[PDB]
Scaffold this active site. Structure first.
Site, PDB file in Angstrom:
ATOM      1  N   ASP A  55      -6.951  -5.487   2.519  1.00 45.84           N
ATOM      2  CA  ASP A  55      -7.000  -6.157   3.947  1.00 45.84           C
ATOM      3  C   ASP A  55      -8.130  -5.734   4.637  1.00 45.84           C
ATOM      4  O   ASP A  55      -8.375  -6.200   5.882  1.00 45.84           O
ATOM      5  CB  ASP A  55      -5.789  -6.073   4.642  1.00 45.84           C
TER       6      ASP A  55
ATOM      7  N   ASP B 136      -7.890  -1.024   0.315  1.00 45.86           N
ATOM      8  CA  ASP B 136      -6.782  -2.053   0.838  1.00 45.86           C
ATOM      9  C   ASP B 136      -7.428  -3.475   1.238  1.00 45.86           C
ATOM     10  O   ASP B 136      -7.972  -3.543   2.002  1.00 45.86           O
ATOM     11  CB  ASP B 136      -6.227  -1.637   2.015  1.00 45.86           C
TER      12      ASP B 136
ATOM     13  N   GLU C  43      -2.255  -4.385  -1.211  1.00 50.97           N
ATOM     14  CA  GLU C  43      -2.185  -5.627  -0.427  1.00 50.97           C
ATOM     15  C   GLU C  43      -2.661  -6.880  -0.488  1.00 50.97           C
ATOM     16  O   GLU C  43      -2.658  -7.624   0.300  1.00 50.97           O
ATOM     17  CB  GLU C  43      -2.655  -5.049   0.837  1.00 50.97           C
TER      18      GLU C  43
ATOM     19  N   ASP D  94      -2.192   3.813   8.610  1.00 48.26           N
ATOM     20  CA  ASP D  94      -1.132   3.583   7.975  1.00 48.26           C
ATOM     21  C   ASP D  94      -0.780   5.062   8.202  1.00 48.26           C
ATOM     22  O   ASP D  94       0.144   5.694   7.222  1.00 48.26           O
ATOM     23  CB  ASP D  94      -1.197   3.227   6.446  1.00 48.26           C
TER      24      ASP D  94
ATOM     25  N   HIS E 187       0.772  -1.240   0.012  1.00 48.75           N
ATOM     26  CA  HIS E 187      -0.003   0.105   0.066  1.00 48.75           C
ATOM     27  C   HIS E 187       0.913   1.138  -0.047  1.00 48.75           C
ATOM     28  O   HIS E 187       0.196   2.321   0.069  1.00 48.75           O
ATOM     29  CB  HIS E 187      -0.929   0.025   1.318  1.00 48.75           C
TER      30      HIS E 187
ATOM     31  N   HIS F  49       4.864   1.160   3.970  1.00 45.99           N
ATOM     32  CA  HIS F  49       3.434   0.837   3.652  1.00 45.99           C
ATOM     33  C   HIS F  49       2.652   1.274   4.746  1.00 45.99           C
ATOM     34  O   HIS F  49       1.309   1.051   4.689  1.00 45.99           O
ATOM     35  CB  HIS F  49       3.512  -0.571   3.103  1.00 45.99           C
TER      36      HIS F  49
ATOM     37  N   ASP G 151      -8.999   0.308   4.547  1.00 48.38           N
ATOM     38  CA  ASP G 151      -7.841  -0.170   5.018  1.00 48.38           C
ATOM     39  C   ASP G 151      -8.232  -0.671   6.488  1.00 48.38           C
ATOM     40  O   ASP G 151      -8.969  -0.014   7.191  1.00 48.38           O
ATOM     41  CB  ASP G 151      -6.586   0.680   4.925  1.00 48.38           C
TER      42      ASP G 151
ATOM     43  N   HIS H 293      -5.889  -0.590   8.737  1.00 49.58           N
ATOM     44  CA  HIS H 293      -5.076   0.413   9.376  1.00 49.58           C
ATOM     45  C   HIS H 293      -4.987   1.786   8.820  1.00 49.58           C
ATOM     46  O   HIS H 293      -5.400   2.102   7.694  1.00 49.58           O
ATOM     47  CB  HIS H 293      -3.609  -0.104   9.193  1.00 49.58           C
TER      48      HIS H 293
HETATM   49  N1  LIG Z   1       0.318  -2.454   4.615  1.00 55.21           N
HETATM   50  C1  LIG Z   1      -0.593  -2.202   5.572  1.00 55.21           C
HETATM   51  N2  LIG Z   1      -1.726  -2.225   5.573  1.00 55.21           N
HETATM   52  O1  LIG Z   1      -2.372  -2.407   4.598  1.00 55.21           O
HETATM   53  N3  LIG Z   1       0.196  -1.976   6.654  1.00 55.21           N
HETATM   54  C2  LIG Z   1      -0.087  -1.819   8.196  1.00 55.21           C
HETATM   55  C3  LIG Z   1       0.724  -1.553   8.840  1.00 55.21           C
HETATM   56  C4  LIG Z   1       0.575  -1.195  10.251  1.00 55.21           C
HETATM   57  C5  LIG Z   1       1.230  -0.010  11.027  1.00 55.21           C
HETATM   58  N4  LIG Z   1       0.622   1.151  10.117  1.00 55.21           N
HETATM   59  C6  LIG Z   1       2.842  -0.120  10.482  1.00 55.21           C
HETATM   60  O2  LIG Z   1       3.256   0.750  10.006  1.00 55.21           O
HETATM   61  O3  LIG Z   1       3.411  -1.244  11.084  1.00 55.21           O
HETATM   62 MN   LIG Z   2      -2.609   0.044   4.024  1.00 54.33          MN
HETATM   63 MN   LIG Z   3      -4.125  -2.824   6.074  1.00 55.66          MN
END
Ligand SMILES: N=C(NO)NCCC[C@H](N)C(=O)O
Ligand SMILES: [Mn+2]
Ligand SMILES: [Mn+2]
Ligand SMILES: N=C(NO)NCCC[C@H](N)C(=O)O
Ligand SMILES: N=C(NO)NCCC[C@H](N)C(=O)O
Ligand SMILES: [Mn+2]
Ligand SMILES: [Mn+2]
Ligand SMILES: [Mn+2]
Ligand SMILES: [Mn+2]
Lengths: 314, 314, 314
Positions: free
Chosen positions: B229, B227, B272, B123, B96, B136, B119, B121
Site C-alpha cells: 500500500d 507494504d 497488505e 503503523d 502487516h 496491523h 508503507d 503508514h
Molecule cells: N495495514 C495498515 N497499513 O498497511 N494499516 C494502517 C493503519 C493506520 C493506523 N496506523 C491504524 O492503526 O489505524
Molecule cells: Mn502496514
Molecule cells: Mn499501509
C-alpha cells in the site's frame, strides 16, 4: 528551416498488424498542418508504397527478411535524398525496423551524426540472439559497426552499411531488455539511461548529460529515433509491446523539448504506433495526439508558449 | 544464495477480509518460478496454517490479540529457523501485523539488522494510541525497545521481545500518519521520509541517504518490510487502506533495486495485498504483478536487463 | 492565527456553468470543519451573493464585463476588510476572474505582497489579445501596472487599480499559453516555471527558487492564487479547461506545503472547480477532496503528520 515528412506504412518487422496504419492516423490527427504552424516549411512526401517480396523465407529464425531489407532500402534512399536538400527528415512509421532505413539514409549525408533512442527496448538483438525473427528488435545491430560480421549476413540487407559505433548512440527509456541485448550494450560499452537512471537523475540531468556525452567535442547532427512505446502504457497505449513503468508524457515532452532547444535536429523517427491495438478508441486517440504532440515539440512548440517574433501583440 | 518463501495467510490484524488470500494470489501469479529464474535457489515453505484462538477477547480496544500473538509467534520461529540456515526469508503476507513475527524471527539470528519500512503508514501506534484494536497498525510498537513498558503487556505477545531501537528503523512512503504516531516518531527520533521528502530529494537521494544513515558505520543485514500500500493507489489498488499521493511503481522498483544492489538483503516482507479488494479484476491483477515484480526486484532483476554470466550470447 | 473563508460563487468570467457551485461543493466536502482541526481559528463568511447587471454589453469581444467588474468589486472589498482585521483570506471560487477581486482587496492592506500563480494558464491576456471575452483569462492584465493603459478601460473595472509589477508575480504549472500571453510574459519579464521547468528542476527546486526570487530581500506576505486546473486532469478532472501533462497531486501538495512552511501566507485562492464538469461522480469527488486537501495543506497539515504540542501522547 524545411521539413519533409515520409510515411513508412510498414509492419513485417513484427507480427501484430496495424503499425502501417501509423502514418495514416498521424496525418489524420492533422500532424501536417500543425507542423506548418511553426517556423518550419513542411512538405509531405506521402507514403512510400512498399512492393511485397513474394516467397520471403525465414532466415533461420528471422522472418520476412527480404521484405524488411527492400522496404528499408527504399527508405534510407529517400532520407539521404531529402537530407542532401538540407531539409529535416521526419519518418512517421510502422514497426521500428524502419530505423535502419531512416538512420542509414541519414548517415549518407551526415556520417558524423549521433543517435538518441527513446524506446522501452534496446532492440539491439541479432539474428543469433533474438527469440524471434522480428527484425523490429534488431535495427541497431545492422547500423552498428562493432556488430558487423558478428552475425550471418541477412537476405535483403546487403545494401546496409554499419554506420555508427556505440560512442554515438544513446538509449533513453530502457525497461525491457533481453539477456543477449544486455550483454551487447555492456560489452560494446553503449551509453544508456534505463528507467532506473531516469529515476535517479531526473529527465533534466538525463538530457543534460546525454548531450555533453555526444556534443561535448564536435557538435554534430542529431537523429532522434522515438519509439512511441518508450512512454508509459497509460500515455501511449496503442502499441505492439507495452512495458509498465516508462517515460511520462511530461518526461517525453521534456526530451523532444531539450532536443529542439539545441537546434541540432536532423532526423526524427515516430515509430511503433498501432492505431488498431487500442483497448478503447480513446486509448488510440490518446496515443495518436501525444505522438503528434511529441513531433511538434521537436519543432518549436514549448510548454511555456510561442509567439511570432517582430509582432507587437500589444 | 538461497531463498525460502513463507506464506502468512492471515488477516485478524484488521477487519477487511481477503489479505490471507495474499500468498494464494502471489504464488498463482507465478512468484515462485520467476524467482527461480534468478541466481538464487528458491524453496517454497508453504502456508503456515494458523490455529484459531477460541474466544479471543478485545484487550480494551485492541482486537483479536491472542490470535495475532500466536500467529506471529509461529512465524518469527520459522523465520529465525531459515535465517540460521543462511537463506533469505521472504514473507508473502496477509495484514502487516505479521511484521512482528517476521522481524522478530529475523533478529534472533541477526540482532544487528536495520529495517526499511515502505508503507503509507508508520503503523507505530500502541494499544493506547490506536483508535482501533487493529494490531496491523502497531507492529513497530512491539518491536521497538524505546516503546517497551510504554503500554500494557498484550495478551498473546508475551514471547515478543523489543528488538530494535529507532536508530535502526527507516520509513519510506509515509503519507497517512496518526497524531499519536507523529508524536512517537518525533519524540523517539525515528529517521523517515514522508512523501514530501520523497518529493524533495527524489527517490534516488532518499535511498542514497537512508543507506549511509544505516550502513554508514557497520554494514549489517537488511530487513525490507514492504507494504504494497505504500505505492500510489493507481498502482496497487487491491489493498486495505489506500492513500493517494504515494510511491510510484517506478519509485518503488527503484527502492527494491537499490536494496538489491547492496547485497545486504536478509528478510523481505510483501504485506497488505487483498486479492478481494479490487474495484475490478484488473486492479487486483495489477496489484498482484507489481507486487510480484517488486520481489524479483529485490532478487536481481534490473530494469536494464540481466544475462547469465560466462555465456557468450554472440 | 485566524482564517476567514469567502465564497465567490461566480461564473460569468467564462461560458461553462457550474463554477459558482464551487464553494457549494467545497463546504459540503467539509472544508470548514477540517480547517478548524488546525491551529487556526476559522470563520466562514458565507457566499457573497452577486447582484446581476441587467443588459451587460460585450465590450468589443469581452463578455459579461459589468458583471465581472461589480462582482470583483464587491469581493476585493471583503478581502481588504478581513485583511485589515489580520485574518488570512481564503477565497473558494467560481471562475478564476475573481482573482482581481481577491488580489486587489489583498493589496489594499498589504501592497508589498507577491503572488504565486498555480494555473495551467497564464491568463495574462488583454481585451485586445483574448480570442474570447472570457475575463477569467485576463485577471493578471488588470492587476498588472506594466499593463495599465495598454488596453481600453473596461466597463465595470474602473475601481480596479493595477497593484503589482511583474517582479512580484510567479507562475507555476503553465502548459497552455496563448501567443499574445507568451509575448507579454517574455516582454514584461515575468518569472515563471512551465511544466518543462517543473520537469527540469523538480518541484522542490522550483519552490526553493521562486521563494528567494520573491522573499530574497524583503520578506513580504504571500498570495497563493491556486487554480485547481494546474494539476493534471487525472487529479482534478472537474474543471473548465483541462490540459494534460500538469502538476501532480504530490507536486501540488508539495507547493502548498512549502508555502505553509514559510508562514507568509496571507491570501489563498482555490478557483476553477466545476462540480458539474465531471465525466463521472467520482471525478468530481476526486477534484473536490484534492482541492480541499490542498487548502488544509496551506494551513498546517503536513504529509508526515501533525500532533497538538505540549501534549504527551505517551
Ligand atoms: N495495514 C495498515 N497499513 O498497511 N494499516 C494502517 C493503519 C493506520 C493506523 N496506523 C491504524 O492503526 O489505524
Ligand atoms: Mn502496514
Ligand atoms: Mn499501509
Ligand atoms: N518494436 C519493438 N519495440 O519498439 N520491439 C521490441 C522487441 C523486444 C526484443 N528486442 C525482441 O526482438 O523481441
Ligand atoms: N479559467 C482559465 N484557467 O483557469 N482559463 C484559461 C483560459 C485560457 C486563455 N488565457 C483564454 O483567455 O482563453
Ligand atoms: Mn523499437
Ligand atoms: Mn519498444
Ligand atoms: Mn486561471
Ligand atoms: Mn487554468
Amino acid at each position: 528551416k524545411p521539413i519533409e515528412i515520409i510515411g513508412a506504412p510498414f509492419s513485417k518487422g513484427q507480427p501484430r498488424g496495424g503499425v502501417e496504419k501509423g502514418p495514416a492516423a498521424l496525418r489524420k490527427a492533422g500532424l501536417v498542418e500543425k507542423l506548418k504552424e511553426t517556423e518550419y516549411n513542411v512538405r509531405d512526401h506521402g507514403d512510400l508504397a512498399f512492393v511485397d517480396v513474394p516467397n520471403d523465407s525465414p532466415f533461420q529464425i528471422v522472418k520476412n527478411p527480404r521484405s524488411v531489407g527492400k522496404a528499408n532500402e527504399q527508405l534510407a534512399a529517400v532520407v539521404a535524398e531529402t537530407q542532401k536538400n538540407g531539409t529535416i527528415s521526419v519518418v512517421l512509421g510502422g514497426d521500428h525496423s524502419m530505423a535502419i532505413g531512416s538512420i542509414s539514409g541519414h548517415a549518407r549525408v551526415h556520417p558524423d551524426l549521433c543517435v538518441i533512442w527513446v524506446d522501452a527496448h534496446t532492440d539491439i538483438n541479432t539474428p543469433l540472439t533474438t527469440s524471434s525473427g522480428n527484425l523490429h528488435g534488431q535495427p541497431v545491430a545492422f547500423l552498428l559497426k562493432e556488430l558487423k560480421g558478428k552475425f550471418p549476413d541477412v537476405p535483403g540487407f546487403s545494401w546496409v552499411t554499419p554506420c555508427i559505433s556505440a560512442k554515438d548512440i544513446v538509449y533513453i527509456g530502457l525497461r525491457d531488455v533481453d539477456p543477449g541485448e544486455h550483454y551487447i550494450i555492456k560489452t560494446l560499452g553503449i551509453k544508456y539511461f534505463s528507467m532506473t537512471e531516469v529515476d535517479k537523475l531526473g529527465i533534466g540531468k538525463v538530457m543534460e548529460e546525454t548531450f555533453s556525452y555526444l556534443l561535448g567535442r564536435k557538435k554534430r547532427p542529431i537523429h532522434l529515433s522515438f519509439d512511441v512505446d518508450g512512454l508509459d502504457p497509460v500515455f501511449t497505449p496503442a502499441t505492439g509491446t507495452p512495458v509498465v513503468g516508462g517515460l511520462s508524457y511530461r518526461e517525453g515532452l521534456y526530451i523532444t523539448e531539450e532536443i529542439y532547444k539545441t537546434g541540432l535536429l536532423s532526423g526524427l523517427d515516430i515509430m511503433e504506433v498501432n492505431p488498431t491495438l487500442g483497448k478503447t478508441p480513446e486509448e488510440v486517440t490518446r496515443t495518436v495526439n501525444t505522438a503528434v504532440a511529441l513531433t511538434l515539440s521537436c519543432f518549436g512548440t514549448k510548454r511555456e508558449g510561442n509567439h511570432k517574433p517582430e509582432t507587437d501583440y500589444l
